[PDB]
């Protein structure tokens, strides 16, 4: 026995239901990732932009003292730079999906500038490397190695 016939999208569209859940249909993978980025930007734009800003090692530069410790932690551990290497080492096909995702976030911000909080606009535009950096920070330098455990705080 096999699963039910999977739907085959003929156009790119996002169908949002009553709870703000996006149902993204893409004619191909890159289009799906683009829509996903657009949806996330619409739903959690401000915080995603802030997080990507920190992953660049520019939290202190963009927002000040409250973001300085993380900046030192990420720079000392060479997170921003390693994200460049990791980004460069992505398979051609997957890197395209990462770029499309980033493009979706920029697109949303560009089309709806007044929806993005002022203090976080300076982060635009984002890129596929920013995406890799955030994932690297979250996994390796939050879940596995947290600053509190090392700094002894």
């Amino acid at each position: 026995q096999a699963p039910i016939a999977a739907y085959k999208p003929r156009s790119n569209e996002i169908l949002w239901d009553g709870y703000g859940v996006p149902h993204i249909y893409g004619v191909d993978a890159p289009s799906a990732f683009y829509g996903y980025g657009w949806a996330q930007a619409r739903s959690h734009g401000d915080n995603i932009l802030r997080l990507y800003g920190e992953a660049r090692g520019k939290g202190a530069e963009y927002w000040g003292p409250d973001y300085e410790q993380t900046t030192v932690w990420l720079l000392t551990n060479g997170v921003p730079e390693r994200a460049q290497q990791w980004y460069a080492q992505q398979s051609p096909d997957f890197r395209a999906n990462l770029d499309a995702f980033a493009a979706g976030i920029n697109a949303y911000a560009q089309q709806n500038p007044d929806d993005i909080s002022p203090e976080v606009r300076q982060v635009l535009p984002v890129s596929g490397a920013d995406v890799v950096a955030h994932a690297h920070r979250l996994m390796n330098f939050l879940y596995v190695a947290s600053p509190g455990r090392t700094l002894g705080e």
Binding site: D17, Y36, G37, I48, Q90
Partner: protein
Amino acid sequence: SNSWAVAPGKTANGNALLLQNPHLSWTTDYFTYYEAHLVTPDFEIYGATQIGLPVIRFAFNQRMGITNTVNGMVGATNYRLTLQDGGYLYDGQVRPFERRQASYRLRQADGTTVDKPLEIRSSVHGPVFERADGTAVAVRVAGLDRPGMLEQYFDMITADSFDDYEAALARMQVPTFNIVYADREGTINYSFNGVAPKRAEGDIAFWQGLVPGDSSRYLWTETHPLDDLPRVTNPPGGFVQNSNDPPWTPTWPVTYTPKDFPSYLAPQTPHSLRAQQSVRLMSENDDLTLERFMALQLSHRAVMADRTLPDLIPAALIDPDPEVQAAARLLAAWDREFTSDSRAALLFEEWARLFAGQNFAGQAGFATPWSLDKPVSTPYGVRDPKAAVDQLRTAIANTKRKYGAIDRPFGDASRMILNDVNVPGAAGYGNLGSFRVFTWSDPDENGVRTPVHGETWVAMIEFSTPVRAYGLMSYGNSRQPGTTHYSDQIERVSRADFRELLLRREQVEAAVQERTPFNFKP
């Protein structure tokens, strides 16, 4: 976090069941979950994941699904260095640090920036940080050469068979997490995942503290392959589970023991009462249906009460203080469930805070200590009834101070407040035995507390054809300023009224509110 996967043989209709139940902070931005559905000619994925992430970590579709819980994989080592002559001591010799002059900008309150120099030093172990007390620490992180983390998850949640899933998992690009899998074929799997370095000596406690940084003996360079980590596939018990407990009772009966793996992989600490409940709820029930499965997820038993009240109540009743006697009768009439109308629950928590510590993880007060031989029925009893009664006396004072009475309804103090929505709470701390979790904050001036962490994304899937899934997201799917989708689900949570998760095109079209067609410039 909780996670269940049930094999067909243990269900009524013959389909596998899966529970996605991550517990995380309700306020930390990078821990915020987002629900979405992706459909392409080549694949379909539904589920939740942390904002900013391009791949769904808690995903499922018409064929399979996975879920994650925290296993705390120790993939990093902190080494205490011995500084000497401008370098550090290593195997009796002074080694030089690798230095790098960096710099960064710091924004001032007025909006301008200043340049701050930053020297980056590294020993053979890794980057060096200095602590307040002056201790120089070097951090060595495993897997800094694994760039395929995002792609591995993508290939996992998109696998056409358990074999492809396993092949993806085997790349070792995801550094941590317990991962539970289930598909429509009937396969269920539990994996203690992560990138763990091979060590020559020392147990987990040794490697979690500061390791000597003056000896090459402690400098690891290898990591374990998937084959060395604890894993369980289609066990005889017909189920797999993990509630953040060590991997020693992922199923029942177990399929391995602690001695079968390096002692530095996982701790051998006592399983929490929530984890014990998890094993009991699955092993004790048969002929499960999705409806029955969901009802079980909601269990909020005060298991610690079952292990302590039998001894505490009689002892408190001999105390001359009529209030202590009254408190004991209040606790004795309680059904030991964390329901909204419970009048003894709050008082019990306060006693527990003293008996077992602020986090309720203490073991010193028990008469019978925890034992892996009785993993779901120990610890038990009150070691010192007399002392336990003194703690109860204090608990009474603390309960009145925080809530204004010893018998205030649980749901009157425990609230779920999002924007203009204010609903009564139920269930509570996992360490007291509650399976469904709501880590309540300290009360305010009026004894009102709210969830700080706990149930977030919750989904239960039955891999029938087509699949059937229900779910809920405590804090909505949006947190942007002025959104209408932040507090629009907390009411349903309050009534345990799950939404049907819509995967089929006809269901989606029937529920559409907004349509965003888009053109992507390749």
